[PDB]
Amino acid sequence: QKLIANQFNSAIGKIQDSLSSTASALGKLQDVVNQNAQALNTLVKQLS
Amino acid sequence: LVKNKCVNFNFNGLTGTGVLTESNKKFLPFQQFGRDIADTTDAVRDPQ
Ligand SMILES: *[C@@H]1O[C@H](CO)[C@@H](O[C@@H]2O[C@H](CO)[C@@H](O)[C@H](O)[C@H]2NC(C)=O)[C@H](O)[C@H]1NC(C)=O
Ligand SMILES: *[C@@H]1O[C@H](CO)[C@@H](O)[C@H](O)[C@H]1NC(C)=O
């Protein structure tokens, strides 16, 4: 149990860095947003 | 001329419906109408 406590609590420790130091972490979600803002922006340029 | 109120405007034959406001945009002497991403006229220069 103690050995797993250290291994678990350290594992959650690494997630922070992998999230904060890497922009590609959310690259799925950031694309889901960058598709709509891409689709609407193009839909406005169509007026030209 | 009416500023800051919804009006039906004719400027140099360009017609439409807008809210005429002041602006700091600076046209070179030969430019008359400004245009937008949608090419709908954003800014005009008061002729008189
Ligand atoms: C199982 O592996 C863990 C680590 O994967 C071992 O725990 C490490 O033991 C060393 C001592 O050799 C320490 O320097 C580390 O700090 C320990 N890590 C943790 C997270 O406690 C553990 O000793 C291994 N057990 C067996 C039976 O081999
Ligand atoms: C139009 O006439 C007014 C006065 O009647 C004058 O102030 C104005 O300068 C004239 N238009 C232009 C573009 O100068």
Side-chain angles (χ1 to χ4, degrees):
Chain A
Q1 183 175 355
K2 300 300 287 185
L3 175 62
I4 292 174
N6 294 339
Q7 290 174 334
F8 178 86
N9 288 334
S10 298
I12 303 299
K14 294 175 180 177
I15 300 302
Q16 295 174 333
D17 299 345
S18 176
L19 291 177
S20 296
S21 63
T22 299
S24 67
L26 297 180
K28 291 179 179 178
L29 269 56
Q30 188 61 58
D31 182 68
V32 170
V33 174
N34 287 338
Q35 290 176 335
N36 293 336
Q38 184 64 63
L40 291 173
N41 280 336
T42 298
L43 181 58
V44 169
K45 295 176 183 176
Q46 306 289 92
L47 296 178
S48 61
Chain B
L1 189 146
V2 177
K3 288 179 178 175
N4 297 332
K5 181 182 78 180
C6 185
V7 297
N8 187 340
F9 61 91
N10 183 336
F11 288 151
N12 287 335
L14 175 65
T15 67
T17 300
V19 173
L20 302 171
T21 64
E22 291 178 350
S23 60
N24 62 343
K25 292 179 177 179
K26 184 176 180 178
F27 294 176
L28 294 177
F30 62 92
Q31 291 176 334
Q32 180 64 55
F33 300 149
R35 293 187 187 281
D36 191 2
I37 307 299
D39 189 66
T40 62
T41 293
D42 177 69
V44 298
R45 185 178 67 199
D46 183 4
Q48 292 183 341

